[PDB]
């Protein structure tokens, strides 16, 4: 097939590496491929440089991972490299100098896609956004009059500085709780009124505010000592130590670290040069004079915007990892503190001093339990991409709910080209979780930059500059869609933006121009064709649902593409590509072996039917046969959810947009049975079950094919060990693994003991704990993994003898209740599956696949789906696909043209085969010209062409054989099946486990937890005035014991449900109050105490 | 909205304690105050002088005769200390109390109006005379 | 009843209505250059202008449907009360209208484009602000629903 | 005090408070008998007071007491009664129900106003205890334990059983609920019509009251047990017995969407 | 992430 | 829905009265196994089985259908409870 | 020991001990099957001679909760220790016949 | 408050 | 809910609270005089 | 038999406090690590709060429901349902009286 591309806008540059944000970060963090002597000071090197000397640091190296990635996933081991550190011990006055290479533990390694393996699960470290270090001006919310200065260093490094003016006229300063005049600290910096006269006096009436008689007239050391009266009470000044705490507060690089990016912020805002990241002096003077300057209404002086992306820094994986590493290292040095004294002073090795436990615990904590470390989204490749490109405002060192108001969440004018306006969660995380823009890049300073073309006068160049949010404000930037003839602007009025405002300018005024619209949106957002016709609200939903797309066996790439589809699969590395020009020797399901021009023989194993975190099957299907010529960049094997290297998130189907008998009512969807026949929307899902055999004090838990009370009927599918056989079809209740455990301290109930003898000694030491298939679940057994204690290479948690795992697969066909969605945000569940004869059909007899309700269009205002439908129809009959860029896409004239071109295939061959127009088509056309869709007097041949140009055809109702009055829109729409599936979502409970303490219904392995009945439901029942029903909800169905047992018993016997005993919710209350020494009595009408405990509580 | 606003006007503040056990400036439900004045003027004792009071829903909830209800809402340790020292006996007037206990709510089919209703077939209709 | 892209019918009037809006803008612009108007006055006049024109365009769309296409699907769904309100119908056929700035003030320049015509990338970005605000608004409203109902049950339950 | 997987024990924080209280009381009695100086006796009396406090209300006075290895305050009786997801606060979130269930909803257009489509597989579990007795009444099972063992496997489900379930649910109704329940009509009673498939079929007209749409909303189902509860549900709560808004007095169940459109 | 189920 | 619901509503001064009455009558019909019914054989509520028409298993349907005939007598304090119980157990064991 | 009332998940909505099931108390199913078990046991057990029934009651520990040796039951009734064994076996055989006949107790297992 | 300090002071008296 | 005098035993306080509260979710959170839900709670 | 129409909350005299408790917990011991059983006079002691197993005493002398309310002469454990361990109150006798912090703070 041929793919017709649209749009007049040419992209000067390609899209950057998509996982770049995750990979480069950890690259510059670890510096493993950079030799120790040439290592720049950053990341691990930085933490090492800061924590040492305490014992001094020389270098470090990263060894090779003890196990490969796949084995790490399999055995539940963290994929990591050993961290060795070469250090030396300094003997003072002993003259001795020795050294050691110490093993500090392992550092988790990042894969090629940018994920991690932590204890076997794939984890992603989500990039966190916060305020960049530097100097800002709030201003003061309390007094609207003036502004507050703020000096902010790195999060765990240094204190918080605030400068404010009170009615006393004196300039205050904030450290911790206490505020004191900074005029005292000024003297300590070596400053006198003489230098504070000229330089700082220029601003009107801003000088004498910091002039105070007593303290300013004091010598530097006098003021220095005086500061300690303010800093801490009861501490003797100790003026030699007075240098220690002051240095540590400000002048010390080790304790106080202002960000390197924050250093840059300081240099840029104040317009100075810092010799280091240390405040002290150099910073205080310009910070002050700048404060008074902004106070004085002086040119080029701005109040900082906190949500401006110039002031918003993004700390990536390397940053966070380096932080926790620094913490663990500081705790290690904290161990060295107490370990560098106790015992022998004269003799010890650096190895004897160093305990690497704090470091290992810190890093393992950061990967296992951190809020930014989470289960990878493996549902498809695209989801795995997005999860890496996600930005969180939450987590340690950032906002939380209630700490986040409308202000933090709103899309800033500087989010353009930087953060996607469209893609965010709908819930309580809205605006806090955002995804990086497509073209967007992140420098070491941690700022998001956007590409811009540079223009000279009325001429546009190919030079592309990457500017940050602050730098963007400086210029006047015209849009990318502005008419361009060759390299020069062709319009008199050129639409542009200054400071994030829509300013209309002239060509010569223009400075920079946008590259492509694609820069201003996310990747997910970019996959939506005709986006410009979609309201941002539904578009959001499209962007979000695309990652919820489950890979289909038959999955197709969309008939209408934005053009990113290919590169998405490329950069997600789900698929195999040709590394070098060559020819392929061997091809089959499990491998592809190729030979290149260099005579290199290489065997690429294919991952087949592999269970992801979310249970979707990740399956690679080879697209190339034996003895084929491959070129570098050519696709060898399709990954999950990709068709010929293009992203395949669903199927393209024939949609008719009409109401159908209320089955498409309220966003419900109607589908044709045909879809199931050809296995459209059929996905492979792999459930993973596990069972453990542990040693109880009662005895060992045995995993065995021998289960008491079980016939051979139930056991037939189990092997010798008791495990089920590979390939067996298991329904709910069938045993996956047999197990036996000792019952009730080897105490049988006497009533049981005799009936066991009646039947010939069925009495036994063990009971059946075997793992069965939970209700509603099951499928065909695929893999099994058994691990035991006392066997090579295998060790598990304390107490457990062995562990079995059964990986079951099931191929789910589309069914009623499953969630389908297009990329335009139209979503719904299949409420009906119609037999093909019931479907609406074209005059050539072809039935439609899906019937979409038109009422879904007007209120949601996503028209991109209608155009996708039209263009899809054209491409259905023309046997072609399209690429329609965002905002650059196919225009209604072009679409109508392609429709006219397809109308020849559709209606043209009708005459060639000896057929005219139906009498029914005549009727429809009459009604159509009555409605005004077709010009009266023209031939039906032409009238139908007019209708078809509007994207509407004549449909026949398959049930009545009569036509649907008036024409109906039909066409190819790309629709996805979503991870939400009715099979996983159904639950039911009669009875089951109850909580130990609370005695409320609890979730079992084979049993459902029951629905929680909340206060609002209580209100509903009260309002209804149904007392008894509510009572049941509060008693028998809940925590009450006597009554639930008696009720079940009654229903079983056929007797009506008995009156409720008191619920445990009340009893436990009463007793809690009694434990609080408060008598709670339940009185009679006569005020005579009544026993709610049904006896048993009464002494004697 | 009328029912809610009426619940805001539920409470009054006594200026003159009268012949009852009440003190000056003590907030009390107008229903109970008019009840005490209905009991005391059925005596001939001097009436209690109360000032009408408006408080928002939060406070009009927080201050209530029922300690079971007041317990859930806020600062329950205080509600409970106060309830205990005074030995407050909570008749279960409202719904919240009854659901806390699990007893049938005083509404709908749990209302004493229709609850005690009895049904008898016409065969046992004439079995009342033979039994008497 | 169905929805094709041609069922969103832009009234011809939209052109005229918009053209007049441009000339009437120049008058407001020149009056600023001479010093007759202050910043706030020209701002208020521009917003007033675009509001008037927007309402006019809505009226134009619906009068159009009423006279020349009584059975049009959008118009029918709207009038019947089946689906859609005049504001949405407007955003499909007539102009989108004035988007709100992130600070809460109105943007000076509106969105001339309808949803059929398709938005400019800039216009889209501008609308995204109001989009976000509405999003967090609905998010909060659903975040606690029954807050008020709880407060009210606490007083009225007995 | 309960043992979990492995050899580890899980137990309440209360026990530690009780313990330290006891230790201090006993050491006090001992120090009294030994005739110790009033200094030590005072100290122990004080520590005893503090211990009784921390037991009753932890952290309210002085520093909160914590077990070594963690900075979390031990949860005391006051905390238990209220304020950290407390008794009175836990009774806001609600208690789970025994006969409940949940699934995804799809449109029910063929349903009459008083009916709702209920998945067979789901209904079976919901009505199971009634179903056993109906299996006894019929010739499908000798006894309760028998029928119960008969339903334990899906492959062992007879085609006679569904005919019995149809008898169980005859005349009965179930409650459907969609969260959030904003007003009372957010819970309504329908008589179930057994259907193949895993989805609950919902009447279109009741969608407005429920604020339910078909984009993947799920609804909970509940079973009234008592003949009383059943009665209440069938007169007071029946979907077709509330046609008008209890708020505005105007009809809540009314033509909408496609219906209006066609008419 | 919540609302009417985008995420 | 259910036949004659409005009339059942008309028979009482409160809906919840009707609910209590129907419920209690259902309990009566269940405990005594439907032999105490005021309904004649042709008035008996029927259910459609595979075999044929059988007695409707539902006690509430029965109670309502009886109440609609007006043959039942309801109200507060008609008789003492225990006497009613013993009389009913004597008439229908 | 691990503390109950420990936060479970990333939220404070749950405590650890909330998820711990109660294996000690009988399920509504269990207690019912158990009561029916006793009912059906003493239904067919007491329908024979009370002597040979009491033999099984004493020896299997149905009463007093302890299994009595043949000597003790033989001391209670007065017969020989072998006689109590023979009547126990004929009682058990009688119960086997009654079981194969009525199929009542076949299902508890 | 801080009974350790209290008691340690009482001890400091002796 | 029916058109006729309310039946005695009605839950009517609860019905009131729901009746007011349910649409409350449709009242605007963001705006001299308070508007929407903030005004409703102000009253 | 007679339903509860009221709920009263008053203070508790030590007289009233002890009228509750089935014994004094005299020891700061929970259970024994080896036997996994309540220590004598400890927080979990069966002698006070009742039987861990239903209708069975600690030592195991009386295992049948036939003895109910019968307290063992050996282990001193009443023979009843274990449900009473959810209910039965214990207590602690204080050397010096202590103020209830609810009323003080
Ligand atoms: Mg929904
Ligand atoms: Zn004993």
Author numbering:
A (entry chain C): 1 to 54, 66 to 291, 300 to 1119
B (entry chain D): 1368 to 1499
C (entry chain D): 947 to 1104
D (entry chain D): 527 to 789
E (entry chain I): 1 to 7
F (entry chain E): 2 to 94
G (entry chain F): 314 to 422
H (entry chain F): 78 to 91
The authors write:
GE inhibits RNAP by binding to a site—the ‘GE target’—that overlaps the RNAP active-center ‘i’ and ‘i+1’ sites and that includes coordinating ligands of the RNAP active-center catalytic Mg2+ ion, Mg2+(I).
To define the structural basis of transcription inhibition by GE, we determined a crystal structure of Thermus thermophilus RNAP holoenzyme in complex with GE at 3.35 Å resolution. Figure 3A shows that GE binds to the genetically-defined GE target, confirming the hypothesis that the GE target represents a determinant for binding of GE to RNAP. The structure shows that GE occupies the RNAP i and i+1 sites and makes direct interactions with the D2 loop, the link region, and an RNAP Asp residue and water molecule that coordinate Mg2+(I). The sidechain of βGlu565 penetrates the GE macrocycle and makes interactions with six of seven GE residues. GE is oriented relative to RNAP such that the GE dhGln residue is directed toward Mg2+(I) and the GE dmaDap residue is directed toward the Rif pocket. The GE dhGln residue participates in a network of interactions, including H-bonds with RNAP βGlu565, βArg678, and βLys1073, an H-bond with a water molecule in the first coordination shell of Mg2+(I), and van der Waals interactions with RNAP β′Asp462, which is one of the three RNAP Asp residues that coordinate Mg2+(I).
